[PDB]
């Protein structure tokens, strides 16, 4: 089957087992609606996994986008993952409203220790500045800059200060545990 390392389908998680690490009766609902989630995971080694993050959110157009980045990431490759940046010359999405990126992440054991989960992080969005097109920006009914907070915080009574949970998946991406 594979002709080297890091090409093995056998370290890939069942997608049915990649799911929210927590649930809440109330999440933060500031800023445009979004759906932010992990859709796939692959075990690298130890507590390190490669994952696919999927982002969908009400947006302006690519031309209006100044910067779009994941920050606060607990990762062996560092805490920032820019997917678009006019300043830093990163051009890795086609549409701010719907995109995916891959992240290499550290994990911790979940409350069910058949699973692991990633650590909290933020997605920062910046529109309409610093060289971006201003076309449509006056009509935008939301702030030009904002953060989505991702995490399973220490809730009381099911009330979270985060917009969305972090995700969990089976330890080692095993199908059976």
Residue numbers in the entry: 16 to 192
Q: What does the published report state?
A:
Given our finding that Flo11A-mediated cellular adhesion appears to be well-conserved in Saccharomycetales, we wondered to which extent structures are conserved. Therefore, the crystal structure of Flo11A from K. pastoris (KpFlo11A), a variant from the family of Phaffomycetaceae, was determined at a resolution of 1.40 Å. Despite a sequence identity between KpFlo11A and ScFlo11A of only 32%, their overall structures showed a high degree of similarity with an r.m.s.d. of 1.01 Å for 102 Cα atoms after superposition. The surface of KpFlo11A exposed 6 tryptophans and nine tyrosines that cluster in two bands, which were similar but not identical to the aromatic bands of ScFlo11A. Also, both the KpFlo11A and ScFlo11A surfaces were quite rigid given the low thermal B factors found for their surface-exposed aromatic residues. Thus, the core and aromatic surface patterns of even highly divergent Flo11A domains appeared to be conserved, explaining the functional conservation with respect to cellular adhesion. Similar to ScFlo11A, KpFlo11A is able to undergo homophilic interactions with a KD of 31.8 µM. We also measured possible heterophilic interactions between ScFlo11A and KpFlo11A, where we found a clearly decreased interaction with a KD of 121.1 µM. Thus, both ScFlo11A and KpFlo11A are competent for efficient homophilic interactions in vitro, but they are able to clearly discriminate between each other.
Flo11-type adhesins are of interest in the context of kin discrimination, because Flo11 from the budding yeast Saccharomyces cerevisiae (ScFlo11) confers cell aggregation by homotypic protein-protein interaction. The structural and mutational analysis of different Flo11A domains demonstrates that homotypic Flo11A-Flo11A interactions depend on evolutionary conserved aromatic residues, which form two bands at the Flo11A surface.
